[PDB]
Amino acid sequence: LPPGWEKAMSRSSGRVYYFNHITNASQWERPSEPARVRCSHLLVKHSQSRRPSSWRQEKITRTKEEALELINGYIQKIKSGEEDFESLASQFSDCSSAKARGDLGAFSRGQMQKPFEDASFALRTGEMSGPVFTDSGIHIILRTE
Numbered sequence: 001l002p003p004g005w006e007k008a009m010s011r012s013s014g015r016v017y018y019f020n021h022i023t024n025a026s027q028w029e030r031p032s033e034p035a036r037v038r039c040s041h042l043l044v045k046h047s048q049s050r051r052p053s054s055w056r057q058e059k060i061t062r063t064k065e066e067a068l069e070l071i072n073g074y075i076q077k078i079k080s081g082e083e084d085f086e087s088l089a090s091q092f093s094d095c096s097s098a099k100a101r102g103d104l105g106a107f108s109r110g111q112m113q114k115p116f117e118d119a120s121f122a123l124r125t126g127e128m129s130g131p132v133f134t135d136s137g138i139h140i141i142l143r144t145e
Ligand SMILES: O=C(O)c1[nH]c(-c2ccccc2)nc1C(=O)N1CCOCC1
Pocket: 043, 050, 051, 053, 054, 094, 095, 096, 097, 104, 112, 113, 116, 135, 136
């Protein structure tokens, strides 16, 4: 296994999978570092969010737990193909980058919140993370470059 990835067995099914404790990604197939990466993300804020407010909603009042149900929905609908990242990010992200289909351009290490950044650098190009928590809210990162 490449570093960060823990083999695990599936609770409900008994299909052995893989889990990245950095990205929070889960995937079935076996898995297998640059100055800059490019990612978009879909942020869902909550009441304990550093800034509990977005373009979507003046005061955010959902709880972290509700934030997480929202994200898990998004993550499922994307994974199944029944929406795409950019579409959902456009309608539903609480970051001002929603209008750019979540996209944030390239950045290197040192620029972001460190969980977003560690999750951002652990993804291969094209991979979406699982829920990633920072002081802003919970994120779905897709590294594009
Ligand atoms: O309102 C926003 O538009 C927002 N967007 C993001 C964000 C977070 C990570 C990467 C790109 C953007 N954080 C925020 C946010 O809450 N901030 C900025 C910092 O975290 C504390 C307050």
